[PDB]
Design a protein around this motif. Structure first.
Motif, PDB file in Angstrom:
ATOM      1  N   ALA A  68       0.881  -1.365   0.017  1.00 43.86           N
ATOM      2  CA  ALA A  68       0.139  -0.122  -0.071  1.00 43.86           C
ATOM      3  C   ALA A  68       0.685   1.134   0.064  1.00 43.86           C
ATOM      4  O   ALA A  68       0.698   2.255  -0.646  1.00 43.86           O
ATOM      5  CB  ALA A  68      -1.010   0.130   1.224  1.00 43.86           C
ATOM      6  N   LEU A  69       1.814   1.294   0.858  1.00 45.17           N
ATOM      7  CA  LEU A  69       2.852   2.487   1.031  1.00 45.17           C
ATOM      8  C   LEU A  69       4.140   1.857   1.180  1.00 45.17           C
ATOM      9  O   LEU A  69       4.325   0.737   2.005  1.00 45.17           O
ATOM     10  CB  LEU A  69       2.287   3.269   2.261  1.00 45.17           C
ATOM     11  CG  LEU A  69       1.118   4.034   2.236  1.00 45.17           C
ATOM     12  CD1 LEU A  69       0.542   4.319   3.439  1.00 45.17           C
ATOM     13  CD2 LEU A  69       0.976   4.909   0.957  1.00 45.17           C
ATOM     14  N   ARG A  90       5.272   8.256  14.227  1.00 44.23           N
ATOM     15  CA  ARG A  90       4.900   7.870  12.915  1.00 44.23           C
ATOM     16  C   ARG A  90       4.317   6.424  12.755  1.00 44.23           C
ATOM     17  O   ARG A  90       3.398   6.104  12.033  1.00 44.23           O
ATOM     18  CB  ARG A  90       6.092   8.214  11.940  1.00 44.23           C
ATOM     19  CG  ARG A  90       6.408   9.653  11.824  1.00 44.23           C
ATOM     20  CD  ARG A  90       5.800   9.900  10.409  1.00 44.23           C
ATOM     21  NE  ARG A  90       4.288  10.551  10.847  1.00 44.23           N
ATOM     22  CZ  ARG A  90       3.175  10.562   9.876  1.00 44.23           C
ATOM     23  NH1 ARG A  90       3.401  10.500   8.519  1.00 44.23           N
ATOM     24  NH2 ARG A  90       2.053  11.106  10.589  1.00 44.23           N
ATOM     25  N   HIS A 144       0.846   6.153  13.667  1.00 49.55           N
ATOM     26  CA  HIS A 144       0.032   6.888  12.666  1.00 49.55           C
ATOM     27  C   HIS A 144      -0.183   5.912  11.541  1.00 49.55           C
ATOM     28  O   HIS A 144      -1.357   5.592  11.128  1.00 49.55           O
ATOM     29  CB  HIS A 144       0.769   7.994  12.224  1.00 49.55           C
ATOM     30  CG  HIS A 144       0.181   8.631  10.940  1.00 49.55           C
ATOM     31  ND1 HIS A 144       0.670   8.298   9.563  1.00 49.55           N
ATOM     32  CD2 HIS A 144      -0.905   9.166  10.801  1.00 49.55           C
ATOM     33  CE1 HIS A 144      -0.218   9.163   8.882  1.00 49.55           C
ATOM     34  NE2 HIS A 144      -1.110   9.546   9.320  1.00 49.55           N
ATOM     35  N   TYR A 145       0.827   5.050  11.160  1.00 55.19           N
ATOM     36  CA  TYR A 145       0.332   4.034  10.063  1.00 55.19           C
ATOM     37  C   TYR A 145      -0.180   2.878  10.579  1.00 55.19           C
ATOM     38  O   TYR A 145      -1.141   2.269   9.831  1.00 55.19           O
ATOM     39  CB  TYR A 145       1.872   3.661   9.422  1.00 55.19           C
ATOM     40  CG  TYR A 145       2.345   4.771   8.583  1.00 55.19           C
ATOM     41  CD1 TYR A 145       1.733   4.884   7.623  1.00 55.19           C
ATOM     42  CD2 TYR A 145       3.457   5.438   8.894  1.00 55.19           C
ATOM     43  CE1 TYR A 145       2.113   6.006   6.795  1.00 55.19           C
ATOM     44  CE2 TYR A 145       3.725   6.556   8.421  1.00 55.19           C
ATOM     45  CZ  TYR A 145       3.237   6.803   7.099  1.00 55.19           C
ATOM     46  OH  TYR A 145       3.614   7.960   6.493  1.00 55.19           O
ATOM     47  N   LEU A 170      -3.748   4.289  10.735  1.00 56.94           N
ATOM     48  CA  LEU A 170      -4.166   4.129   9.036  1.00 56.94           C
ATOM     49  C   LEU A 170      -4.650   2.752   8.558  1.00 56.94           C
ATOM     50  O   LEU A 170      -5.779   2.659   8.123  1.00 56.94           O
ATOM     51  CB  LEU A 170      -3.171   4.609   8.206  1.00 56.94           C
ATOM     52  CG  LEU A 170      -3.260   4.793   6.862  1.00 56.94           C
ATOM     53  CD1 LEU A 170      -4.651   5.749   6.349  1.00 56.94           C
ATOM     54  CD2 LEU A 170      -2.218   5.424   6.189  1.00 56.94           C
ATOM     55  N   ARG A 216      -8.015   1.606  10.203  1.00 59.64           N
ATOM     56  CA  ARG A 216      -9.400   2.139   9.732  1.00 59.64           C
ATOM     57  C   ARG A 216      -9.611   2.428   8.329  1.00 59.64           C
ATOM     58  O   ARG A 216     -10.538   2.826   8.081  1.00 59.64           O
ATOM     59  CB  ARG A 216      -9.023   3.822  10.319  1.00 59.64           C
ATOM     60  CG  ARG A 216      -8.166   4.665   9.796  1.00 59.64           C
ATOM     61  CD  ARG A 216      -8.322   6.098  10.632  1.00 59.64           C
ATOM     62  NE  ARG A 216      -7.312   6.720   9.863  1.00 59.64           N
ATOM     63  CZ  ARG A 216      -7.736   7.586   8.819  1.00 59.64           C
ATOM     64  NH1 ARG A 216      -8.699   7.168   8.082  1.00 59.64           N
ATOM     65  NH2 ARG A 216      -6.704   8.270   8.064  1.00 59.64           N
ATOM     66  N   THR A 217      -8.436   1.715   7.610  1.00 64.04           N
ATOM     67  CA  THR A 217      -8.630   1.751   5.997  1.00 64.04           C
ATOM     68  C   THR A 217      -8.371   0.295   5.492  1.00 64.04           C
ATOM     69  O   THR A 217      -8.280  -0.744   6.363  1.00 64.04           O
ATOM     70  CB  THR A 217      -7.919   2.852   5.269  1.00 64.04           C
ATOM     71  OG1 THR A 217      -6.618   2.151   5.313  1.00 64.04           O
ATOM     72  CG2 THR A 217      -7.927   4.166   6.029  1.00 64.04           C
ATOM     73  N   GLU A 218      -8.598   0.099   4.073  1.00 64.17           N
ATOM     74  CA  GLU A 218      -8.339  -1.069   3.389  1.00 64.17           C
ATOM     75  C   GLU A 218      -6.956  -1.521   3.531  1.00 64.17           C
ATOM     76  O   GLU A 218      -6.413  -2.670   2.918  1.00 64.17           O
ATOM     77  CB  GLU A 218      -8.683  -0.889   1.997  1.00 64.17           C
ATOM     78  CG  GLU A 218     -10.322  -0.644   1.753  1.00 64.17           C
ATOM     79  CD  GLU A 218     -10.906   0.909   1.881  1.00 64.17           C
ATOM     80  OE1 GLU A 218     -10.227   1.681   2.266  1.00 64.17           O
ATOM     81  OE2 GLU A 218     -12.049   0.971   1.790  1.00 64.17           O
ATOM     82  N   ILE A 219      -5.944  -0.506   3.928  1.00 64.12           N
ATOM     83  CA  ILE A 219      -4.357  -0.797   3.691  1.00 64.12           C
ATOM     84  C   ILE A 219      -4.315  -2.154   4.879  1.00 64.12           C
ATOM     85  O   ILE A 219      -4.834  -2.201   5.819  1.00 64.12           O
ATOM     86  CB  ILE A 219      -3.646   0.362   4.339  1.00 64.12           C
ATOM     87  CG1 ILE A 219      -3.948   1.533   3.223  1.00 64.12           C
ATOM     88  CG2 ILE A 219      -2.371   0.009   4.417  1.00 64.12           C
ATOM     89  CD1 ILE A 219      -3.515   2.646   3.740  1.00 64.12           C
ATOM     90  N   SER A 277      10.085 -11.213  -4.029  1.00 64.67           N
ATOM     91  CA  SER A 277       9.448 -10.513  -5.215  1.00 64.67           C
ATOM     92  C   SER A 277      10.237  -9.419  -5.586  1.00 64.67           C
ATOM     93  O   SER A 277      11.344  -9.208  -4.935  1.00 64.67           O
ATOM     94  CB  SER A 277       8.286  -9.587  -4.891  1.00 64.67           C
ATOM     95  OG  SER A 277       8.392  -8.802  -3.598  1.00 64.67           O
TER      96      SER A 277
END
Lengths: 190, 190
Positions: free
Chosen positions: A1-2, A14, A17-18, A21, A24-27, A182
């Motif tokens: 995602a990031l 930080r 924070h991640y 994030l 609360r999201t699809e990440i 990968s």
């Protein structure tokens, strides 16, 4: 995602924070640097070759970062920059890309790079991966699996540039059994 | 990049949600399916071969979706599933993986796959990519660039599985000059 640097995850504010994030999201996954293009492992390494040339920095506490992410069900891909390594290639210049004028080749930023043809750098990079897997990374992502961009000189052993990189990735596959690896094939097929 | 299905970006509410997310966070790119593993292009295609076999659905309005993302500085990767295509391999069975016993091979979910060794499927996949580039995708990500996982029969022409896939990727590279292409090498180096 990031993509997150080691410095970023090494900040508790930080890091939280991640985590928030992703919660609360699809990440549900981050890429975090193991070894960025500065040539330093981003946490304290126990690997003798790494410690010997000082090729690690305290960017983050890898145990705490991985535990925090795992505790919140976040997948952590470790980014491992390969041949764009100005630390190993300068500490051990036999491993560097050579100039046609003799001595180590330098790019437009005055940096030396590892010669992919010199197989003596390969165990060094793979050991970094192995240690990262032992710490808990869920996946290893190899980046800068390439030569730099008329003044470079190589001893190819009769292998084309794409063939030697393919050999490196086969070595990685063999040495990291059972690990999710990968890397982008269009860094190789150009 | 987070992965979005066609159906997801085909909902105006969902599209706006993902725009908002990118605007308020570090996210700056999404992967959006061009052709998912159902074998349908996710927007109306004008490629004659695709239209002839009904291999498209109106999952989303590609012009609207790309415009909305670009207007907000979001990079759009188009995901193009290659050989896990049960539509082309059933509509044009000459292109399917064959069974040793007889007929077209079918996986555990009863689906046919395209045979990588049959080069007559290659221009079909590349033409999909060319069309997506023309619509405005910023990058093409190829997935399922692999054989299915003693019952499959191939005419190999003496080439190993990894070699025919590399040939396919070389064809894509040559046919898509100047396009940002990506694919995972460890879907090929096993």
């Amino acid at each position: 995602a990031l993509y997150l640097t080691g410095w970023t995850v090494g900040s508790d504010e930080r890091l939280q924070h991640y985590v928030d994030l992703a919660n609360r999201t699809e990440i549900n996954a981050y890429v975090v640097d193991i070894k960025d293009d500065d040539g330093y492992v981003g946490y304290e390494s126990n690997i003798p070759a790494v410690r010997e040339i000082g090729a690690w920095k305290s960017k983050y506490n890898v145990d705490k970062v991985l535990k925090t992410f795992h505790d919140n069900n976040i997948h952590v891909i470790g980014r491992l920059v390969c041949f764009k390594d100005p630390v190993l290639s300068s500490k051990k210049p036999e491993l560097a890309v050579k100039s046609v004028n003799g001595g180590s080749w330098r790019d437009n930023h005055n940096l030396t790079w590892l010669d992919p043809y010199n197989k003596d750098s390969w165990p060094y990079l793979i050991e970094i991966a192995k240690e990262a897997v032992e710490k808990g990374f869920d996946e290893i992502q190899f980046d800068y699996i390439r030569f730099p961009n008329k003044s470079m000189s190589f001893n190819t052993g009769g292998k084309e540039k794409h063939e030697i990189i393919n050999e490196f990735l086969a070595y990685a596959r063999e040495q990291l059994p059972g690990v999710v690896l990968s890397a982008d094939v269009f860094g190789i097929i150009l």
